[PDB]
């Protein structure tokens, strides 16, 4: 069993915790309880190989913005999450991307761009704009709903594949 250290990052309220708990427990959390730092484990077979995912669920609130280096040092791959009905959260993505690159001193960190809340009709970030950003980073873009499970396994397991081929 290979172990993978995944970290979920992004602005407050975009659904990082709901995505993680949907993956871990198959349950959608309706409450908005701001995270400080949570960690989960999941044994799962991906492309025929069993592994153990360690998933760090991080704080999006700006009051925690000075406490990120310590978790970025430990992570092997990052889910960069925004919400497709929150343009500010999409604009915050590049700040996370640049900080991860600085801390890990690398232009080649495994990452997936995630546009969450795709069950909602009132989109304000178009898929094309997010896909253009992902291409500029060299990473895939996956739209998800923590509520319906759409794309959730695809987002996390695509990140595992990135780490595996790194």
């Amino acid at each position: 069993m290979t172990e993978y250290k995944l970290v979920v990052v992004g602005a407050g309220g975009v659904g990082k915790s709901a995505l993680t708990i949907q993956l871990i427990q198959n349950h959608f959390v309706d409450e908005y309880d701001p995270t400080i730092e949570d960690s989960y484990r999941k044994q799962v077979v991906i492309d025929g190989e069993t592994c153990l995912l360690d998933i760090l669920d991080t704080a999006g609130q700006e009051e925690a913005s000075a406490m990120r280096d310590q978790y970025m040092r430990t992570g092997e791959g990052f889910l960069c999450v925004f919400a497709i009905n929150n343009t500010k959260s999409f604009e915050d993505i590049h700040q996370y991307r640049e900080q991860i690159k600085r801390v890990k001193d690398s232009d080649d960190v495994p990452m997936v761009l995630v546009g969450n809340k795709c069950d909602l009709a009132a989109r304000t970030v178009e898929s094309r704009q997010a896909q253009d950003l992902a291409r500029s980073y060299g990473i895939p873009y996956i739209e998800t709903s923590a509520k319906t499970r759409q794309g959730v396994e695809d987002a996390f397991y695509t990140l595992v594949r990135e780490i595996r081929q790194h």
Binding site: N26, F28, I36, Q43, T50, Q61, E63
Partner: protein, 469 residues
């Protein structure tokens, strides 16, 4: 340079690390032993977060610190004094200017705010995942509510207001799938005819599915509070470990029910059909990763009453002997193949709990509570980390739900199974063994013949599922 710290005389958590108060294992450090003050300092450290350590500590701390004392210590940790103005600040103020307060601002940003946020994260995890401390001590809950509800100042406000709501919800206290569950399967017994339900009349696929749902729910209900301190072995086990004991008693009852079905079927041909059906149920347990169920069957087939039934064994098809052999091999060599298989499958699964129990008990019994160093007694934290590695493994397999539909009547049938009746254990297991001797006597006594007891067809419908439109 590093930030200066409060005097250790006014703030106990600023004492320097030394081997008299903390010992590290040989990229964050791993603690072997320390005083409770040093453990709490590192639990809420300004330089990094340690979510594993938070879970380990909150799972195991009651072996070295009372809940009321833990709360006092983390409140003490939270209340960090701010430094006085520096010389440059002094000179600015003397000239009527605003000080830069560079050192104060850095200490707030890089020491106070991270430590305070990490104290609140301990409180949040304590309330969310270890709420039994508060269920059992209403005054502890009052103190926690008061502490959280009186934290001032805007940096912590979002988490303070959230933790207040979480506590209130915990006081008064849904699954989605990648696909649809398969259709419930029926054999001789038809829906709603619970009076005919039995080993051979329910569909063997559906027996295995419904027992797996039941056994999964029993597995998922066991909390770490039932395990730490080896409390399921002590005199108050019924008070402290009720979900674990319910789970074990279900497993014991099913094993005894399998044995009873076998030895109370006195006709040889019918008893072969009974054993064959049980091995088919074992095959579906394997397909579902229900290892508790696999071992329930293996334990029955290796029991003294069943193991000796050579005439029954002789008629079991070779393929079914092979299925039973490979199931038995999981337990050989101290469960070597079981442990490897558990770590290789794709959950959901139902682990066998007994191995975890033995490893927790032996870890507790085989390691000292304290280490003596330089005249001081330090808490042996490595021992607690080992226990929490086991409880963490248990919890990891409790997350994944089975995509199987409940059949309420079949569920009730297996919930109410009571093979021993009003008999005591020794009386009942002697009865099973005497039945074994009756139906296949010891050589050189001749093998008798017995009348059939089942009026319905014995042919199995098999264990491959069906799918109408």
């Amino acid at each position: 340079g590093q930030m200066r710290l409060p005097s250790a005389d006014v703030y106990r958590f600023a004492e320097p690390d030394s081997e008299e108060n903390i010992i590290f294992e040989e990229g964050i450090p791993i603690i072997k032993a320390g005083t409770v003050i040093k453990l709490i300092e590192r639990l809420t450290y300004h330089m990094y977060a340690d979510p594993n350590f938070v879970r380990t500590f909150l799972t195991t701390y009651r072996s070295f610190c009372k809940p009321q004392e833990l709360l006092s210590l983390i409140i003490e940790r939270f209340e960090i004094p701010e430094p006085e103005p520096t010389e440059a600040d002094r000179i600015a103020i003397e000239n009527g200017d605003q000080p830069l307060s560079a050192e104060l601002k850095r200490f707030r940003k890089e020491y106070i705010q991270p430590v305070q946020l990490r104290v609140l994260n301990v409180c949040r995890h304590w309330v969310e995942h270890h709420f039994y401390d508060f269920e059992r001590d209403a005054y502890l809950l009052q103190r926690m509510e008061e502490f959280i509800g009186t934290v001032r100042g805007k940096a912590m406000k979002k988490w303070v207001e959230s933790i207040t709501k979480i506590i209130q919800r915990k006081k008064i206290a849904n699954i989605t799938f990648q696909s649809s569950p398969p259709t419930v399967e029926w054999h001789i017994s038809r829906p709603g005819h619970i009076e005919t339900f039995d080993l051979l009349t329910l569909h063997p696929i559906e027996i295995a599915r419904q027992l797996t749902l039941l056994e999964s729910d029993l597995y998922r209900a066991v909390q770490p509070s039932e395990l730490v301190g080896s409390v399921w072995t002590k005199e108050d086990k019924e008070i402290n470990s009720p979900n674990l004991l319910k789970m074990i008693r279900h497993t014991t009852n099913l094993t005894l029910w399998f044995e009873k079905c076998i030895v109370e079927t006195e006709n040889l041909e019918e008893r072969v059909a009974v054993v064959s059906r049980i091995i088919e149920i074992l095959q579906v347990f394997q397909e579902l990763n229900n290892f508790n169920g696999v071992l329930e069957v293996v334990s029955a087939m290796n029991s003294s009453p069943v193991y000796r039934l050579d005439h029954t064994f002789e008629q079991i098809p070779s393929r079914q002997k092979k299925i039973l052999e490979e199931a038995h091999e999981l337990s050989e060599d101290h469960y070597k193949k079981y442990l490897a298989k558990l770590r290789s499958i794709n959950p959901p699964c139902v682990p066998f709990f007994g191995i975890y129990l033995t490893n927790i008990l032996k870890t507790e019994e085989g390691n000292p509570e304290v280490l003596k160093r330089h005249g001081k007694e330090l808490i042996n934290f490595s021992k607690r980390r080992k226990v929490a590695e086991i409880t963490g493994e248990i919890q990891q397999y409790q997350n994944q739900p089975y995509c199987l539909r409940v059949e309420s009547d079949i569920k009730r049938f297996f919930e109410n199974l009571n093979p021993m009746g009003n008999s005591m254990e020794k009386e009942f297991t002697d009865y099973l063994f005497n039945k074994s001797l009756e139906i296949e006597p010891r050589n050189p006594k001749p093998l008798p013949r017995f009348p059939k007891k089942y009026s319905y067809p014995l042919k199995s419908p098999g264990v491959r599922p069906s799918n109408p439109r």
